[PDB]
Design an enzyme around this catalytic site. Structure first.
Site, PDB file in Angstrom:
ATOM      1  N   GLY A   9      11.111  15.746   6.342  1.00 32.10           N
ATOM      2  CA  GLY A   9       9.919  16.334   5.606  1.00 32.10           C
ATOM      3  C   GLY A   9       9.026  17.240   6.426  1.00 32.10           C
ATOM      4  CG  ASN A  32      11.931  20.306   4.197  1.00 34.72           C
ATOM      5  OD1 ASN A  32      11.291  19.138   4.150  1.00 34.72           O
ATOM      6  ND2 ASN A  32      12.192  21.028   3.129  1.00 34.72           N
ATOM      7  CB  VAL A  73       9.844  12.889   1.745  1.00 34.81           C
ATOM      8  CG1 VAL A  73      10.563  13.902   2.467  1.00 34.81           C
ATOM      9  CG2 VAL A  73       9.902  11.259   2.189  1.00 34.81           C
ATOM     10  CB  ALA A  75       3.895   8.574  -2.187  1.00 38.48           C
ATOM     11  CG  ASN A 101      -1.652   9.362   2.764  1.00 42.32           C
ATOM     12  OD1 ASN A 101      -2.569   8.866   3.457  1.00 42.32           O
ATOM     13  ND2 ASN A 101      -1.420  10.393   2.588  1.00 42.32           N
ATOM     14  CB  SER A 127      -6.522   8.853   8.711  1.00 37.26           C
ATOM     15  OG  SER A 127      -7.697   9.271   8.264  1.00 37.26           O
ATOM     16  CE  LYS A 182      -5.021   7.387   5.557  1.00 42.23           C
ATOM     17  NZ  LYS A 182      -5.068   7.450   4.245  1.00 42.23           N
ATOM     18  CG  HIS A 185      -9.281   5.478   6.262  1.00 42.25           C
ATOM     19  ND1 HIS A 185     -10.034   5.649   7.390  1.00 42.25           N
ATOM     20  CD2 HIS A 185      -8.670   6.447   5.892  1.00 42.25           C
ATOM     21  CE1 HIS A 185     -10.100   6.897   7.510  1.00 42.25           C
ATOM     22  NE2 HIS A 185      -9.358   7.649   6.533  1.00 42.25           N
ATOM     23  CG  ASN A 186      -7.640   6.852   2.028  1.00 37.98           C
ATOM     24  OD1 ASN A 186      -8.018   7.510   2.986  1.00 37.98           O
ATOM     25  ND2 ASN A 186      -6.604   7.364   1.475  1.00 37.98           N
ATOM     26  CD  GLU A 189     -11.484   9.731   2.763  1.00 39.67           C
ATOM     27  OE1 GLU A 189     -10.711   9.402   3.553  1.00 39.67           O
ATOM     28  OE2 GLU A 189     -10.938  10.684   1.893  1.00 39.67           O
ATOM     29  CE1 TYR A 190     -11.071   8.178  -2.188  1.00 38.35           C
ATOM     30  CE2 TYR A 190     -11.643   7.628  -4.463  1.00 38.35           C
ATOM     31  CZ  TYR A 190     -10.892   8.359  -3.561  1.00 38.35           C
ATOM     32  OH  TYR A 190      -9.877   8.860  -4.052  1.00 38.35           O
ATOM     33  NE  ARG A 286     -14.132  10.540  -4.660  1.00 36.09           N
ATOM     34  CZ  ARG A 286     -13.408  10.861  -3.556  1.00 36.09           C
ATOM     35  NH1 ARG A 286     -12.185  11.191  -3.935  1.00 36.09           N
ATOM     36  NH2 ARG A 286     -13.867  10.895  -2.533  1.00 36.09           N
TER      37      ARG A 286
END
Lengths: 466, 466
Positions: A9, A32, A73, A75, A101, A127, A182, A185-186, A189-190, A286
């Protein structure tokens, strides 16, 4: 002819990781599926130790054994199709590292199936964006521990280093633990971005501040306890101009995009029974920003109070700052409570102190505040909630007055503060020895005979109320 | 000789449902695999048209074709096991009616699977508790539209009747639309109880009212526009003394649970992109109520302001009343916005007005309120948000001042009001033509290069922010 590690990738993040790995002295093979981007990497890498391959058979045969293959690559289908096409050509003991992710349940599914063919699978959260991937990201690898230890030197070499020399990578746990960490973590972050945006709303819409007074306020905040990457880039954002020399961020369409992963954190928290009120409100925030046309219509039909602040502006800016810092504490307390519960129900044996450690640098939520989370669990590995840690308990018991003033001021002036509102409501609910849930319990026994427990007696009780 | 309808599963609700059907003059066969529950119902059904059977073969042979079978068994595997053990024994065109609290997605799987073998399957949501099932429940059947018409005579006979005579049952929609609608009913029920519980907390902790004064307040509120079954029973609950003449509601342990079914409403809202903040925080409110011993520990280390009111209490009581009504409007607006989106996504063609109609009686959330939701959609079938309905519009723009005063006072006095807070925040976000999501977009483009759109120019943009 064999190289030390392979990357599949060659888009900007797979390419940037391979160069990071090469920067530290390891020989890398790259592949790739569309060979034309491999042809750009060789040109963009003339002189480095990048050995291109142009088939999955030449790629797998180019790597030392046990083979270390980093998948970069996209998801879902392309990942499973790459795994499935790789599996016949692999030997017992080889190691695949999915770096996308990925939803952690996919990693759990891929780890279990690959383990039956003696292939190790590490789902690794990455990240730091593309600049971080090139210079030093925060890595969250989960899977077989023995597999992790065979690639740990590479992970340690490329990951960001915190101020104490600690590399921002550690073994997270079994199977999907890394990709789970992970995702959380996001979610954090939101919330961090929503709380920053609520701060900006108060400054813009209640204190009438210009973009340069907003920028300077955030730069000031970044010099103290609130120092974070997200506050730091917010200060830069309010300084960027367009062609007409007006603030660019005021030209941006206020429709927050989201590629999932934030909604996944709350969906899991609801399954687990974890009150993730603040991250979840930031997800819903959001959602409602994305129905712009509906909001424009309702603004011409629904009345509200005018925003009018007549007190001291500088003293209220300090309250917003205290309110932002305490909301961060409560949100992280919720987020870290989700991770203890997920550790328990998955038997991951998560060391929460190690997660704050690897988030001090590299990731998007990186902040000096995270060092205080590590200090909390170092001083007390059994800490049930961050709100009880002596340092954090000391902050919230004093900052709660500023938070209460901010929420009450925004509510009375029509400025939506969903992250500030749920923060002070979490603090007041978690610290409440008695909650009105006794009325809920009596209602459920009234209309459903669901029974209830008592405060003074023990046992299960059922009442005929009428 | 042969019966008109059959019920499998003779726990209290299937049992009470069977008696209901027999009470209207229908013949019913009953089956429970544990034969003891069949024997108990045999003695309790002296003089009734209840024919017991003790094998699925015997059960199926005792019903006239097309067979009408009501599944009132445990949700999940016990429901699939019964459907599986019934499939070979049925004839093309027979009708299975699953009436448990089932995940609508399981109903979609069963309906689509049973259609390949030419069997009709109705997933029907049932609301009303054990007494409602005996006398007149609310019924939310979804599935094959012609299979509903063959059982519609029975459902109409057993359902509760609104006082205009209409039965609280109607064809909801295809496959799993009935169970979906029942699931959203429960989420709404969670928000209704939490908002009533937040009013109680405000009356007790902030106004210092006794259980007598709390009971009388709810009864007075039940006499007006807030007329509801949940408010009616709440006034009764505060009149119930224990053995020592003490308010028994106060002796009840304040733990609501972590494994309810209302969480499924929030999980679905998160995947649909619908902002369901009031129901979701009502679910979260139950979570933190469940960690009682943790809350008691936090109450000994975390401080807050002592609640104190020094103004007119009767004026503030009326503001709590307006805040409760307005928050219900905001909660239902979200819940009904969720169903509108799910009906579009699942191609169900839901008629939300007919939905409010069958919730006027029989269900738990029944109230005079639901007649106005019915009127809102009859007046405007394409209504996008109930906040835009002329009647609800007139209420919220008038009542927002009481809601803001209540939220502000509650925050300043340490009384958690997660339902009230997310209501006023939802009203202030939905009506805001401009939200601070523009900063979120700018940040996402800073660190993630996720691009953004502009309010002025059209197109997609990316910026080198520094």
């Amino acid at each position: 002819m064999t190289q030390q590690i392979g990357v599949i990738g060659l888009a900007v993040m797979g390419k940037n990781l391979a160069w990071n790995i090469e920067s530290r002295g390891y020989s890398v093979s790259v592949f790739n599926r569309s060979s034309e981007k491999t042809d750009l990497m060789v040109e963009e890498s003339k002189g480095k130790n990048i050995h291109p391959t142009y088939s999955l058979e030449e790629f797998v045969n180019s790597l030392e054994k046990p083979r270390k293959i980093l998948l970069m690559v996209q998801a879902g289908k392309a990942t499973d199709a790459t795994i499935d096409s790789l599996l016949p050509l692999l030997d017992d003991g080889d190691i695949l590292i999915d770096g996308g992710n990925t939803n952690y349940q996919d990693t759990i599914r891929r780890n279990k199936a690959l383990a039956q063919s003696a292939i190790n699978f590490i789902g690794m959260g990455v990240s730091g964006g593309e600049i971080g991937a090139l210079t030093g990201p925060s890595l969250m690898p989960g899977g077989q521990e023995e597999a992790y230890n065979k690639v740990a030197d590479i992970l340690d070499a490329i990951a960001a280093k915190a101020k104490d020399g600690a590399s921002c990578v550690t073994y997270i746990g079994p199977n999907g633990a890394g990709h789970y960490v992970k995702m959380v973590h996001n979610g954090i972050e939101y919330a961090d971005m929503q709380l920053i945006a609520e701060s900006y709303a108060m400054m813009k819409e209640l204190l009438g501040m210009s973009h340069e007074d907003i920028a300077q306020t955030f730069k000031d905040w970044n010099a103290g306890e609130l120092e974070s990457y997200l506050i730091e880039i917010t200060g830069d954002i309010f300084m960027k101009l367009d062609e007409n020399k007006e603030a660019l961020v005021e030209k941006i369409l206020d429709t927050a995009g989201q590629k999932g992963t934030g909604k996944w954190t709350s969906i899991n928290a609801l399954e687990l029974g974890i009150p993730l009120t603040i991250i979840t409100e930031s997800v819903f925030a959001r959602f409602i920003s994305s129905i712009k046309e509906e909001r424009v219509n309702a603004s011409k039909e629904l009345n509200g109070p005018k925003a009018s602040f007549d007190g001291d502006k500088k003293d209220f800016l300090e309250k917003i700052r205290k309110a932002l810092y305490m909301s961060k504490i409560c949100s992280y307390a919720q987020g870290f409570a989700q991770m203890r519960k997920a550790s328990e129900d998955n038997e991951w044996n998560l060391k929460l102190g190690d997660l704050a450690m690897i988030w001090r640098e590299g990731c998007i939520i990186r902040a000096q505040f995270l060092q205080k989370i590590k200090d909390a669990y170092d001083n007390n590995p059994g800490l049930q909630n961050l709100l009880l840690d002596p340092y954090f308990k000391n902050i919230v018991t004093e900052y709660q007055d500023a938070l209460r003033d901010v929420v009450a001021t925004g509510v009375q002036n029509g400025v939506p503060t969903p992250g500030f509102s749920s923060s002070i409501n979490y603090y007041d609910s978690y610290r409440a020895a008695d909650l009105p849930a006794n009325l809920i319990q009596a209602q459920r026994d009234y209309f459903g005979a669901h029974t209830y427990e008592r405060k003074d007696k023990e046992g299960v009780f059922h009442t005929q109320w009428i």
